């Protein structure tokens, strides 16, 4: 129920299902963006995954234990978005990040645009390590999208 | 609401992928609710 890999986050009531996001299972912990789940509990097969840590400002949440993803973008190299869009199989998109320049420092950012339910898809370095999650970003003047490479701290 | 997860694949870098997208340099702010906005 907590096997390593990338997962879709789905919701259903009485009728069909909707993909609201994506996340990463690593070291027994599920990692996604806060806006995907609003910090609510998740079902995994027959089991229940309870939120353990989260931070609205970073837009992140972890389930079953503390945040485990600690790889960082090296500030130089191309990365891959492992996009898991609603209704489509996982696909890798390589890109050279741009930069969000903030008062508190620079954050890598990817100019790749996918449906809202792609939120939480992992961004990878060349070793396959997850350097952050896709889906907290901004809309630029022409309507296109830029996502931060959002990474949490491994305490 | 039944919010649930389903496996979608292994996490692997794909060799010989073609680079795409640009590399924008943007001035942004982040508020306490986790929203980014452009500084203009």
């Amino acid at each position: 129920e907590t096997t390593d890999g990338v997962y879709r986050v789905m919701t259903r009531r009485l009728l069909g299902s909707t993909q609201v996001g994506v996340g990463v299972m690593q070291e027994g912990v599920f990692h996604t963006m806060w806006h995907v789940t609003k910090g609510a509990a998740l079902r995994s097969g027959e089991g229940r995954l309870d939120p353990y840590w989260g931070d609205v400002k970073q837009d992140l949440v972890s389930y079953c234990g503390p945040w485990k993803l600690d790889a960082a973008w090296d500030g130089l190299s191309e990365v891959q978005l492992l996009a898991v869009p609603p209704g489509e199989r996982a696909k890798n998109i390589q890109t050279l990040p741009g930069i969000f320049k903030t008062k508190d420092g620079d954050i890598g950012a990817v100019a790749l645009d996918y449906p809202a339910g792609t939120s939480g898809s992992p961004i990878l370095d060349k070793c396959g390590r997850v350097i952050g999650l896709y889906g907290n970003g901004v809309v630029i003047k022409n309507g296109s999208y830029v996502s931060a490479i959002t990474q949490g701290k491994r305490e | 609401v039944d919010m649930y997860i389903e496996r979608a694949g292994d996490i692997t870098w794909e060799k010989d992928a073609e680079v795409t997208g640009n590399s924008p340099r943007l001035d942004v702010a982040l508020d306490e609710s986790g929203d980014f906005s452009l500084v203009e």
Binding site: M33, H35, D113, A116, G117, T118, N136, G137 | -
Partner: peptide, 4 residues
């Protein structure tokens, strides 16, 4: 974005 289909910001989120």
């Amino acid at each position: 974005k289909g910001x989120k």
